[PDB]
Paper text:
The majority of these plant intracellular receptors belong to the nucleotide-binding leucine-rich repeat (NLR) protein family, similar to those involved in certain animal cell-death or innate immune responses. The N-terminal CC or TIR domains are typically described as required for downstream signalling following perception of pathogens, the LRR is implicated in auto-inhibition and/or effector detection, and the central NB-ARC domain is posited as a regulatory domain, acting as a “switch” that determines whether the protein is in an active or inactive state. Here we characterise the NB-ARC domain from the tomato NLR NRC1, which we have expressed and purified from both bacterial (E. coli) and insect (Sf9) cell culture.
Isomorphous native crystals of the NRC1 NB-ARC domain were generated, and X-ray data collected to 2.5 Å resolution. Iterative manual rebuilding and refinement resulted in a final structure consisting of 252 of a total 346 residues present in the expressed protein construct. Several regions of the protein could not be modelled due to discontinuous electron density, including much of the ARC1 subdomain, and the solvent-exposed ɑ-helices of the NB domain. Submission of this model to the DALI server returns APAF-1 as the major structural homologue, despite sharing little (24%) sequence identity. The electron density within the nucleotide-binding pocket of the NRC1 NB-ARC domain, and the surrounding regions, was well resolved and allowed us to unambiguously position a molecule of ADP, and the side-chains of interacting residues. These included lysine 191 of the Walker A (P-loop) motif, aspartate 267 and 268 of the Walker B motifs, and histidine 480 of the MHD motif. Using PDBe PISA, we defined a network of side-chain and main-chain interactions between the bound ADP and the protein. This network includes lysine 191 (P-loop motif) and histidine 480 (MHD motif), as well as hydrophobic interactions from the GLPL motif, and other surrounding residues, resulting in a ligand-binding pocket with over 90% of the ADP surface area buried within the protein. The NRC1 NB-ARC domain structure in the vicinity of the bound ADP is unambiguously defined by the electron density, as are the relative orientations of the NB, ARC1 and ARC2 domains. Here, the NRC1 NB-ARC domain behaves as a monomer in solution and packing in the crystal lattice does not suggest a functionally relevant oligomerisation state.
Numbering used by the authors: 155 to 171, 176 to 207, 210 to 219, 223 to 230, 244 to 253, 262 to 283, 288 to 302, 306 to 329, ...
């Protein structure tokens, strides 16, 4: 629950939630579409809608994850979130899954206009100050830009720094041992969900070096530097599934 400025923005999409609606959330990458959907998915809706997350991307086999296309269209038979849809043809074939039920949609494409698209707002100058203050201590409205800005120097003046170059600005302050592990996310598909334990054994074999213990600390710091997003946690090993943002992936 570390989200700012989306209290009034989520309610607007909640009032949107007459048998099956689309509800598309349009916005440039890094604006907070996945973050807003998480706030909406976990908003007090126990008495309203069940509730499962289905992450797709630019990549039919995701039907079975809770419990041959004919078998994939019969046993699928509420509110379910679609994380990232890239084209109209991707939704025009997956929609025949399970027809007061709704489906939440977030995407970066305005061409996916299916029924008025709710364009996500930008953080104001005051709400951006709150996000930067809490993400550094604990610029133009883009939350990803505010997130990438990692305070490596805590001096009396930080005016020396007043989206690729912002990633480079946090990339230049990374130690040499962390650069090879951060760029290794380019060897995986765009938006790939990498298991943390598997990624650690891959870093050891690649020569990025007890070794499995400090490799987690390399992953913890990259998350602390706000460069790697943790998707799933647990109680046996904490960080379970992680991924890198699509804008940070273009840099890798
Ligand atoms: N309202 C917000 N408050 C705090 N952090 C945010 C907010 N919106 C986005 N972020 C941060 O930006 C990063 C990437 O945003 P993301 O949800 O991927 O946007 P999109 O879904 O539009 O690509 C996330 O790690 C998240 O922490």
């Amino acid at each position: 629950d570390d989200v700012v400025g989306f209290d009034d923005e989520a309610q607007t999409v909640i009032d949107r939630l007459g048998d099956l609606e689309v509800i598309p959330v349009v916005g440039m990458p890094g604006l907070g579409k996945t973050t807003l959907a998480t706030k909406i998915f976990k908003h007090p809706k126990i008495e309203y809608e069940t509730r499962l997350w289905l992450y797709v991307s630019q990549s039919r086999e995701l039907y079975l994850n809770i419990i041959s296309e004919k078998d994939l269209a019969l046993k699928v038979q509420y509110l379910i979130v679609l994380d990232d849809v890239w084209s109209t043809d991707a939704w025009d074939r997956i929609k025949i899954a399970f027809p007061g039920n709704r489906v939440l949609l977030t995407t970066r494409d305005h061409r996916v206009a299916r029924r008025s698209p709710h364009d996500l707002k930008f953080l104001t100058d005051e709400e951006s100050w709150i996000l930067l203050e809490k993400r550094a201590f604990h610029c133009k409205g883009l939350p990803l830009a505010i997130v990438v800005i990692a305070g490596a120097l805590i001096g009396k003046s930080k005016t020396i720094k007043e989206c690729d170059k912002l990633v480079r600005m946090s990339y230049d302050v990374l130690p040499y041992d962390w650069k090879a592990c951060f760029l290794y996310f380019g060897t995986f598909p765009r938006g790939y969900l990498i298991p943390a334990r598997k990624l650690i054994r891959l870093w050891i074999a690649e020569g990025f070096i007890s070794p499995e213990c400090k490799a987690e600390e390399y992953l913890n710091e990259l998350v602390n530097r706000n460069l790697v997003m943790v998707m799933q946690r647990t109680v046996d090993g904490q960080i379970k599934t992680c991924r890198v943002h699509d804008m940070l992936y273009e840099f890798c």
